[PDB]
Amino acid sequence: MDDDIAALVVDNGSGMCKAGFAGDDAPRAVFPSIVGRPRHQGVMVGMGQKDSYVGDEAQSKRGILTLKYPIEHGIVTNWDDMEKIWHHTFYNELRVAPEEHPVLLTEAPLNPKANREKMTQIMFETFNTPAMYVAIQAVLSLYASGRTTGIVMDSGDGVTHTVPIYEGYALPHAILRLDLAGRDLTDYLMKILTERGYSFTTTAEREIVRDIKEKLCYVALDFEQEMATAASSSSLEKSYELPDGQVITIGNERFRCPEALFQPSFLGMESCGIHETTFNSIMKCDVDIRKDLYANTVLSGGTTMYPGIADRMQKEITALAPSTMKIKIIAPPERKYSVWIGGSILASLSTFQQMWISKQEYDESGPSIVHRKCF
Amino acid sequence: ALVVDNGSGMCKAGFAGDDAPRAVFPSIVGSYVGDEAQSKRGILTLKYPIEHGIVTNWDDMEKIWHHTFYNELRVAPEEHPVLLTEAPLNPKANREKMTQIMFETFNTPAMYVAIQAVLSLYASGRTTGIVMDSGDGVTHTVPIYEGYALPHAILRLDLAGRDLTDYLMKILTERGYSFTTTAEREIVRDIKEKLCYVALDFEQEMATAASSSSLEKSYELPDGQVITIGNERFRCPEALFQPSFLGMESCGIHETTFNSIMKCDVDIRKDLYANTVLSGGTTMYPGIADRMQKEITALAPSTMKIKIIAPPERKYSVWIGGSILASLSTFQQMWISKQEYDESGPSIVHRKCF
Amino acid sequence: QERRWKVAAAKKLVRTVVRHHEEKQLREERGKKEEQSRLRRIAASTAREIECFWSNIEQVVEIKLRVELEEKR
Numbered sequence: 040m041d042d043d044i045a046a047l048v049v050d051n052g053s054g055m056c057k058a059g060f061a062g063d064d065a066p067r068a069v070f071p072s073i074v075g076r077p078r079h080q081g082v083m084v085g086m087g088q089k090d091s092y093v094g095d096e097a098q099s100k101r102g103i104l105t106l107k108y109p110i111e112h113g114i115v116t117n118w119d120d121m122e123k124i125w126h127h128t129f130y131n132e133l134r135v136a137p138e139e140h141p142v143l144l145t146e147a148p149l150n151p152k153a154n155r156e157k158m159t160q161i162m163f164e165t166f167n168t169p170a171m172y173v174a175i176q177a178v179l180s181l182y183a184s185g186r187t188t189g190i191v192m193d194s195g196d197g198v199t200h201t202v203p204i205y206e207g208y209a210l211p212h213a214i215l216r217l218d219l220a221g222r223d224l225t226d227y228l229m230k231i232l233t234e235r236g237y238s239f240t241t242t243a244e245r246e247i248v249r250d251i252k253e254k255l256c257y258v259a260l261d262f263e264q265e266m267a268t269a270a271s272s273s274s275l276e277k278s279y280e281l282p283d284g285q286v287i288t289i290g291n292e293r294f295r296c297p298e299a300l301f302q303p304s305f306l307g308m309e310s311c312g313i314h315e316t317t318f319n320s321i322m323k324c325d326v327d328i329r330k331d332l333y334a335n336t337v338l339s340g341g342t343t344m345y346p347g348i349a350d351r352m353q354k355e356i357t358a359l360a361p362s363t364m365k366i367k368i369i370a371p372p373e374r375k376y377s378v379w380i381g382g383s384i385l386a387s388l389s390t391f392q393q394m395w396i397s398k399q400e401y402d403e404s405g406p407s408i409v410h411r412k413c414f
Numbered sequence: 415a416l417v418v419d420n421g422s423g424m425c426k427a428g429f430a431g432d433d434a435p436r437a438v439f440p441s442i443v444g445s446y447v448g449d450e451a452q453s454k455r456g457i458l459t460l461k462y463p464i465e466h467g468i469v470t471n472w473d474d475m476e477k478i479w480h481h482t483f484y485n486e487l488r489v490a491p492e493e494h495p496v497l498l499t500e501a502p503l504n505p506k507a508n509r510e511k512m513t514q515i516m517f518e519t520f521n522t523p524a525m526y527v528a529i530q531a532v533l534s535l536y537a538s539g540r541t542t543g544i545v546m547d548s549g550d551g552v553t554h555t556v557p558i559y560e561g562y563a564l565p566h567a568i569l570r571l572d573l574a575g576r577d578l579t580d581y582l583m584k585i586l587t588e589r590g591y592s593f594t595t596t597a598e599r600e601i602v603r604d605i606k607e608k609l610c611y612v613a614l615d616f617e618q619e620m621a622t623a624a625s626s627s628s629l630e631k632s633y634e635l636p637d638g639q640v641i642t643i644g645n646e647r648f649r650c651p652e653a654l655f656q657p658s659f660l661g662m663e664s665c666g667i668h669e670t671t672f673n674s675i676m677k678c679d680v681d682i683r684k685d686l687y688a689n690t691v692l693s694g695g696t697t698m699y700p701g702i703a704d705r706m707q708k709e710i711t712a713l714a715p716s717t718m719k720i721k722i723i724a725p726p727e728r729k730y731s732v733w734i735g736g737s738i739l740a741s742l743s744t745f746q747q748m749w750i751s752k753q754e755y756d757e758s759g760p761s762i763v764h765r766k767c768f
Numbered sequence: 769q770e771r772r773w774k775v776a777a778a779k780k781l782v783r784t785v786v787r788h789h790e791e792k793q794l795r796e797e798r799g800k801k802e803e804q805s806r807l808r809r810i811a812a813s814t815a816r817e818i819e820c821f822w823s824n825i826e827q828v829v830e831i832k833l834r835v836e837l838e839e840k841r
Contacts, residue, residue, distance in 0.1 A: 108827070178815075182814075182815060185822050187815040187816075187818070187819050204815075206812060206815065207811060207812030207813070207814065207815025208808055208811065208815060209810050209811050218813045384818070385814075393826075412810075414807065414810070414811045454828040532778075536781075536782070536785045537784070539785065539786050539789040540786070541779075541782045541786060542782065560775070560778060561778035561779055561781055561782035561784060562774070562775050562779070577804075652795040657772070738785060738788065739781070742781075742784055742785070744780065744781065744784045745781065745806065748777070765770070768774045768777075768778065
C-alpha cells in the first residue's frame with residue numbers, strides 16, 4: 040500500500056506500552072497505557088474530576104492513586120477502558136484518525152475465541168477500520184532477535200510463558216501458562232519488608248523501589264560468592280534515604296530477590312519453578328530438535344532488563360544441558376523493543392496486504408476469519 | 415425425499431439428509447390437527463388414530479398426513495418419495511392400508527415402510543444389536559442380527575410415558591397437589607420431563623429422601639404457584655423397572671430385554687448384550703443407562719460384556735435412521751414405484767419392504 | 769427365495785450404513801488435520817519472509833562495509 044501512510048503500532052505490554060511510526064529502529068516515545076483511578080471517587084472534587092486518567096495525568100499523581108493492570112492473566116476485564124485508551128491515543132496523543140491509518144493489535148497466546156470475536160466486532164463497528172491483523176507478542180519478539188528457531192523464556196511482569204518455536208512452527212499445544220511471575224515475588228518482597236518493619240504503601244514508593252532494583256540489584260551468578268562478599272566487604276552494600284525523608288536500611292534483600300526469581304524455594308511452597316516449566320516445555324518437543332533449540336536459546340521479553348541475567352542463564356544451561364554441545368545466547372539491548380520491531384517490520388510490507396483481512400473478506404466470512412488468518 | 419415417523423404420541427416429519435426433523439407435533443385430530451386441536455379442544459373432541467403404535471382409524475390418519483404434507487412441511491406429496499415407519503409386530507393389513515392411502519389418496523410417486531427399531535439401529539451405527547424403543551404409548555424390545563429383525567423374539571410391553579404421567583399425577587395427588595384435568599396433564603408432563611430421573615439404587619435413594627432434603631427441588635406452575643418435589647422424582651421412572659407400582663402384572667424393561675435376548679439363538683447373544691441401544695423419548699431420564707447396565711449385568715452371565723448405548727439424540731433416533739436410509743444410493747433400488755403398485759396391489763409392500 | 773433376498777438386502781443396508789458413518793469420521797479428522805497443517809504452513813511463512821529479509825539486510829550491510837566502507841562514506 041501507499042508508502043506515505045504509517046500504520047499505527049500499539050503494543051499494550053504488562054508493564055509498559057510503546058508507540059511510534061514505521062521506518063524507525065527504536066520507539067520514539069514510550070508511556071504506559073494503564074489507567075489509574077482514585078481509591079474512592081468524589082474525594083478530589085473541584086480540581087477537574089475525570090472518569091479516567093491515562094498517561095501523564097495518572098503518572099503525575101501516582102503517589103495517591105492505585106495502579107491497576109487492565110489486562111490480568113491475559114484476560115480483558117472492562118472493554119471501555121481500552122476503548123478510552125485507544126480514543127485518547129488516536130485523538131489526543133497522536134491526533135490521527137484510526138479509519139485513515141491501519142491499526143495492528145497484539146494478543147497474548149491462548150486467547151479465547153470469544154474475546155477475539157468481541158474485539159474484532161468492536162473495532163470493526165466503532166472505528167470502521169478497513170482491515171485487521173493480529174500477531175502474538177512472543178513470536179514477533181523471537182523473530183526480531185534474528186533467528187526463527189529457539190525457545191522464548193519470557194518472565195513477564197504479571198504472567199510467565201514458554202513459547203517453543205521451530206523454524207517458524209509455533210506450538211500452541213506446547214505453550215505453558217504459569218501463574219508465577221514478577222508480580223508474586225515482588226509482592227513477597229514487599230510483604231517480608233513490611234514484616235521487617237519497613238512500611239511501603241504508596242505506589243510512588245513502589246516505583247522508587249522498582250527503579251532502585253532495576254538500577255542497582257544484579258543477578259547473583261554464585262550465591263556463596265555473594266555471601267562471602269557480604270560477610271567480608273560492605274562496598275557493594277549501601278543505605279538509601281527516600282526523597283520524603285524516611286530512613287531505610289536495605290540488607291540481604293537486594294540479592295535475595297534475584298535468587299527468588301530463579302529459585303522460588305525461599306517462599307517454602309512446593310510448586311514448579313519457571314526454569315522447571317521451561318524444561319518441561321522443551322521436553323514436550325521432539326527429542327532430536329532439543330539440541331538445536333538449546334543451541335539457539337534466545338532471551339527476550341518486556342520485563343527482562345535484569346542485569347546479569349544472561350550469565351545466570353548460561354550457568355543454568357551449562358548445569359542442566361550437556362557441555363559437549365555449543366551454547367550461544369544473544370540478548371540485544373533492545374530485546375524489550377523486539378515486539379515493537381516486529382510490528383514495525385510487519386507494518387512496512389507492501390506484499391503483506393494480501394495477508395491482511397480486507398473489508399470484503401471480513402464482511403463475507405464474519406469475525407471468525409481472524410482465527411483462520413491471524414497468528 | 416420425505417421421512418415421516420408417525421409414532422404413538424408425536425409425529426416427526428422432515429426431509430432426508432437432514433440431521434433432525436423439521437416439524438414435530440402431536441398425533442391428534444379434533445377437523446383441526448396437532449397444536450390447533452390441542453389449543454382448541456373446547457370446540458372439537460380429540461382423538462388418537464394410533465393406539466399403542468397401531469393405527470385404529472385411517473380416516474384420522476389421512477387427516478394427520480394431510481396436515482404433515484400441506485401445513486407443516488408445506489410440500490406437494492406427489493413430487494417426493496415418502497419413507498414411513500411402523501411399530502414392530504404391526505398387522506399386515508395396516509401396511510396394505512398405508513400403501514393404498516399413499517398411492518391413491520396423495521398420489522405419491524414412490525414410498526417405503528420400515529421398522530422403527532431397525533432405523534434406531536441405523537442411527538446408532540450398528541449391524542447387530544437389540545433396541546429398547548419406549549415411546550409415548552408402547553414399549554418394544556427388538557433383537558436385530560445383521561440388520562434383520564427377528565420377529566419371534568420381539569416382546570411388547572404395554573408401558574410408556576402416558577402411564578408414567580398418570581402415575582406422577584397419582585403420587586402428586588397423594589402428596590396433596592391436585593392434578594386431574596387434561597390442562598394439568600401437560601403441566602405434570604413438563605414436571606416429568608424436567609425433574610425426574612432414574613435412581614441407581616432405589617431403596618438407598620428412598621432412605622436418603624426420607625432422611626434429608628438434599629434431593630428435593632422446587633417447581634413453578636404457570637399460575638405462579640410454587641411447589642416442591644421429593645422422592646416423586648425417582649418413584650415415577652422406577653415404574654419402568656417395577657410395573658407393580660402401576661398395578662401391572664408384568665416384567666420390567668430390563669427383564670423384557672433379557673428375555674428377548676434369551677429367545678434368540680445362543681451364538682448371537684454376546685453381540686446383543688454388547689449393543690443394547692436405547693431409543694424413544696421415554697428413555698431420556700437421567701441415570702437410566704447405568705441402571706440398565708446394572709440390572710442386565712445382574713441377570714446376564716459374568717462372561718458377557720454389557721454395553722448400553724444411549725445417544726443424547728435418542729428421542730429422534732428413528733427419524734435420523736430414516737433420513738440416513740433414504741439418502742443412500744444403495745437404497746434407491748428399494749423404493750416401491752407407482753407402476754409397481756398399479757400392477758401388483760397393496761401386497762407389493764410385503765414383497766419389497768424388510 | 770424372498771426370505772433369502774430379505775436377509776441379504778438387510779445385511780447390505782447395515783453394512784452401507786456403517787460405512788457411511790465411518791466415512792464421515794474419516795472426512796472430519798482429515799479435514800481438521802489439513803486445517804492444522806495449513807496453520808503450520810501459514811505461521812512459518814511469516815518466519816520465512818522475515819529470515820529472508822534478515823539475509824537481505826545482512827548481505828547489503830556486508831557489501832556496504834566492503835570497498836573500505838564504500839570509499840569511506
